[PDB]
Amino acid sequence: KFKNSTYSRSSVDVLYTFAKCSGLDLIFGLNALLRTSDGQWNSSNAQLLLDYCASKGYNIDWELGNEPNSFRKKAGIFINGSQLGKDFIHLHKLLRKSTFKNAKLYGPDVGQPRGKTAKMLKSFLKAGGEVIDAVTWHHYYLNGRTATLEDFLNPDVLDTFISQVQKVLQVVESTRPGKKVWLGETSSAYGGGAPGLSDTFAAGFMWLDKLGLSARMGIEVVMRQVFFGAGNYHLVDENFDPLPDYWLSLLFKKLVGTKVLMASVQGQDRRKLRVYLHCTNTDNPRYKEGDLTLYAINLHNVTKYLRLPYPFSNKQVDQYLLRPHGPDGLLSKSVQLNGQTLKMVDDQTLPPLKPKPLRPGSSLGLPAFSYAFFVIRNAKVPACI
Amino acid sequence: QDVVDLDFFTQEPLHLVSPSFLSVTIDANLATDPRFLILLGSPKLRTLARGLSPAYLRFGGTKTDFLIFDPKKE
Ligand code: NA
Ligand code: NA
Ligand code: NA
Ligand code: NA
């Protein structure tokens, strides 16, 4: 179904400039389906691009191929994992010979294993794992053509991610123990997202839960498909307006730190009240070393009241509660933070994301079908200091 | 009945995630949009992207394996 297209230096330049001027680090995927007559990756085209980028002084990290597990169906050619590893070794040598200051190499961007093992991943890591700086794999919960609101709210659907992570991590630990593992392309639903669902408040349960579980299970980086683009799972639409998942992501960025802790409910766990705990992001000027960020999902149809364990029971807590805005309910494309609709102030100005301080000692009220961040101030957790 | 007590484990971290833990992609297919250069110049888009720094921006997708660099193309 796919045919080839070309891209220009100007396209590379604009992509690099977009990343650099936004404070983002570009990773560029190279075409793995340029093959020699003896079955090897033909690096000729990539060499031209690498030379161009080096001449411009661009700091770019690289990948080679996307979802090689489906090359037989998409392109009529089978490349086994051992061969793909050999191709990555070749690319590594080209990066080493370049003038790039220590460019990184990620791969192999395999699709999720589903009901099978991750066979191609295993053979790839045996052959080429020494040259990659992190292992990338992809994940979607559902087919966008058939997904329903019920699915987006279903804890059983959310829980399917656990088994997928477990299978991938098992393969990595069996071949390259300790190598970092990244979700290199991931979202709610494949096929461009679920129309009327992947761009709504209801998409946030899958997104926040995936972040929580990824952090808890040992995934180091999660790459959301997509920031901007045609698919319904975009964070920003092609009018350049942010959808609810953008605001969720911005709050996550500002509040959630790098040290992953653990929270769990006491007693029966029906899997609808889901809780995650990190140290608070120290870059946030509101907060201080030792503070904790709890984030929580309530998929029950009634409000649940969370009680924190001692010594956090009577600390000052800042609430960041997200609820949909307007008559579409969970299908809304607008979201409120503590009762205020989130919108840009102007095209160059994000709004303040103000906390709602709660009464010390009060239980944390989490309404039906909502999610929230709670910052526990003066938590003085030594592990966060 | 609707009150839920939480247990916390805080003595030491289970994992460290990257500062760029929450990262983003642009699908490689966007490079076939004739407006690509103009779209990525949007000031609104740049402001929204800066809000997510630090992050990786991964340019890739199915079209990764169907794109060719043409150094003579304008
Ligand atoms: Na999940
Ligand atoms: Na990736
Ligand atoms: Na796109
Ligand atoms: Na992508």
Swiss-Prot record, chain B:
Any idea which positions bind heparan sulfate group? 27-29, 62
Query: Which named protein is this?
Result: Heparanase 8 kDa subunit
Q: What residues of the intact protein does this structure contain? A: 36 to 109 of 543
